[PDB]
């Protein structure tokens, strides 16, 4: 009976592949070849944030383009200000090995996690003034990879146990579980409408899930390596995926297929973090060559390079208004461009 | 300038001073990474070296210097992903029991994957062979032999530079030296002089393991200072 089920599964896969191929009447290049060139963009280090005692691995901008949060392997969370360049708060973490961090849209809670297999949510608007442990979400049999705040009451998290969990800040229990992947989920990316979210995993495929339904509707394939970074388009219909094969891809939620590929014979190092601008004209991507490349999201030509950091570009973030870009590497330096 | 901005700058200076003070305790501690298979006796090591949870931290101070050992037990067989987080550490203590002649190939493959890692090329690996008394008794009784798994055991002689402990049978010495040679053969692969392994023998009731770890870390720090302070 297993053989018949496997044959039916392979037949359905072949059918969906033929369906995705039949809808590919023309590529994006044949349509965008007529657009004006983007030229070159120069970015200079405006602010330099120093004070991290270990290697930086993750950052996140709050609801405003002024505050910033970052994580370091020391176990300390420092709130940075991009304007006056001072340290706001200093949250001491129990586990030093932190790999992800997020800022709530209300500006009241900050989540962190890592190899401790537990998520720590701290409150910044406490009456006592000192930051204390507010929520301790435990139950995951693996290290946390990425976490993002959706609302002021629920938060999704991803672990190495091939399961994603939508916890509730009030009760601290799993409200929705996602067990559709077959490899260690690496990165997450929410939608601007706060109803869907796309996750890139170790199975070289990205899957889109819903907050209420909790079922994967589309499965994108084409990567030949481990997908490590992912970020959705500002409109909410496309998303970029980067792997260690030095080839980034741009998938579409409506077309259900790959649209554009960014690669270069000079770059052989893997991608670590990918993000989009406010309008989505340019695509930022951090590589392991100690640099960060900004290409054109439609023309795939090298628009600019950034060689401010001497170590591996670990984390990259873009503000909500696109006024400044934050780049954090393992050299304990968090640089700001434009 | 407004008063709030000056107070914020003063608080930032205080936080920077606190970070500078924490630098003294963060730089003067050595972070070790304990690795091993499921059958390895690392549990006895961590419970006897006290001189759903994730990372396991053990802080022990010996010879006036402290060590923070980190152990991962709740993770699956996936290792090539999170191991990049364990870079820049002081040492990697890989404990493996040699008494299990059946799963020796798995431990050998694990050690080869750890040594030939792209990110772990700079960090050395301290090799420990635990559970020596059980292996010695099993090879003295003649229940399970080595050549039934590795055909190179018969084509191996006792090295001349061997310095055995007085009061042991030559058979267990030949066996442990063959195991050490087999581990060195895969340890020396792709060495390039950037890192060297430290094969050492240990037991469960053995208590001076801390001294051996301290000496190995001393050698590692000496090599690091020779590579850094322009003397090598």
């Amino acid at each position, epitope marked *: 009976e297993l053989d018949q089920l496997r044959q039916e599964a392979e037949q359905l896969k072949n059918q969906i592949r033929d369906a995705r191929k039949a809808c590919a009447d023309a590529t994006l290049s044949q349509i965008t070849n007529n657009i004006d060139p983007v030229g070159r963009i120069q970015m200079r280090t405006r602010r330099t944030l120093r004070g991290h005692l270990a290697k930086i691995y993750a950052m996140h901008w709050g609801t405003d383009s*002024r*505050l910033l949060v970052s994580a370091s392997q020391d176990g300390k969370l420092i709130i940075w*200000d991009s*304007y006056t360049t001072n340290k*706001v*708060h200093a949250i001491p973490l129990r586990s030093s090995w932190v790999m992800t961090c997020a800022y709530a849209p209300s*500006g009241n809670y900050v989540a962190c996690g890592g190899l401790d297999n537990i998520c720590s949510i701290y409150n910044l*608007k406490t*009456r*006592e*003034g*000192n930051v204390r442990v507010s929520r301790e979400l435990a139950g995951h049999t693996g290290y946390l990879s990425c976490c993002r705040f959706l609302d002021d009451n629920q938060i999704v998290t991803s672990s190495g146990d091939t399961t994603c969990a939508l916890w509730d800040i009030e009760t601290g229990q799993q409200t929705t579980t996602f067990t559709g992947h077959t490899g260690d989920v690496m990165s997450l990316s929410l939608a601007p409408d706060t109803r869907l979210f796309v996750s890139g995993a170790c199975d070289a495929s990205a899957k889109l899930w819903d907050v209420r339904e909790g079922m994967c509707r589309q499965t994108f394939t084409g990567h030949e390596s481990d997908i490590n970074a992912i970020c959705f388009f500002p409109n909410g219909n496309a998303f970029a995926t980067g792997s260690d094969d030095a080839t980034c891809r741009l998938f579409d939620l409506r077309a259900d297929q790959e649209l554009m590929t960014y690669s270069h014979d000079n770059i052989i190092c893997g991608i670590t973090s990918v993000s989009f601008s406010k309008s989505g004209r340019l695509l930022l991507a951090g590589y392991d060559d100690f640099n960060c490349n900004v290409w054109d999201a439609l023309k795939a030509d090298r628009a600019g390079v950034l060689a401010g950091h001497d170590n591996r570009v670990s984390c990259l973030g873009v503000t909500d208004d696109g006024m400044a870009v934050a780049t954090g590497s393992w050299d304990s330096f968090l640089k700001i461009w434009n | 300038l*407004s*008063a*709030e*901005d*000056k*107070a*914020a700058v*003063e*608080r930032s200076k*205080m936080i920077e001073k606190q970070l500078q003070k924490d630098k003294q305790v963060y730089r003067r501690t050595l972070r070790l990474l304990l690795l091993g298979a499921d059958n390895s006796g690392k549990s006895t090591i961590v419970k006897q070296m006290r001189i759903t949870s994730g990372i396991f931290e053990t802080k022990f101070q010996v010879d006036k210097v402290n060590f923070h050992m980190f152990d991962v037990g709740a993770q699956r067989d996936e290792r090539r992903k999170w191991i990049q987080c364990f870079n820049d550490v002081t040492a990697i203590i890989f404990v493996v029991d040699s008494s299990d002649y059946n799963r020796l190939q798995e431990a050998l493959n694990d050690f080869k994957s750890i040594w030939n890692n792209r990110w772990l090329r700079t960090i050395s690996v301290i090799l420990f062979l635990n559970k020596q008394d059980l292996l010695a008794e099993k090879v003295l009784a003649g229940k399970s032999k080595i050549e039934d798994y590795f055909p190179e055991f018969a084509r191996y002689t006792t090295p001349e530079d061997a310095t055995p402990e007085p009061g042991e049978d030559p058979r267990v010495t030949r066996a442990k030296y063959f195991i050490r040679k087999e581990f060195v053969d895969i340890s020396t692969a792709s060495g390039d002089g950037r890192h060297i392994c430290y094969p050492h023998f240990t037991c469960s009731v053995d208590t001076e393991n801390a001294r051996r770890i301290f000496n190995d870390c001393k050698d590692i720090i000496l090599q690091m200072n020779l590579r850094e302070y322009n003397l090598v």
Partner: single-chain antibody
Amino acid sequence: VQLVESGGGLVQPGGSRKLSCSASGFAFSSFGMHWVRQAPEKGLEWVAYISSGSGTIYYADTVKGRFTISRDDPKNTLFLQMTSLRSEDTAMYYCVRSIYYYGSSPFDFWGQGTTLTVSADIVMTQATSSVPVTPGESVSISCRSSKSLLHSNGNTYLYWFLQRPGQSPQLLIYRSNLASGVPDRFSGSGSGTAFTLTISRLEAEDVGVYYCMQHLEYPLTFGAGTKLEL
């Protein structure tokens, strides 16, 4: 949080007195402290200010040199040494906490204070000293400043306090921005020289005196105070 002050009594002019203030329930080391004196049937006046770690300590122009203030972080205490007391030093002293960061609320909690009976600056003026108003209708209070409180960064430094009869003052507005625990009925709007505080519906618990404070320089100055008759 809780602030307990002690040290009041009958002191003759020219003596010395050590007022003590114990804090309990919050991080006293991270919060800067301020002293505010209030005379019987008069306005408020800033006495002194101390920062975290005693790195920034400042006094008012009328008490510079005579009075001093110190803090003890291990014991979590604040001490105020007042020497060579004058005949006008009879007043009630309040010790208040304030933290400075982006999105903070300085002067959020007001202590209980202790009474003591002995024997340029931006002066804040209020054209409406007493407005007898019926509960249920909106209240509009005006405030005029002699110097532009709008700094180059674009932030407006102005604080509103509501001192109820027989109770400690409460912070209503710290920056347009509403303070924590304060209902949304209060609002503030105006330019860099004129400000208006609007209350949509006044209730029986909203009775009190409204004081305004500027925070552009270190020597803070309070207003005359606007009281409302229930």
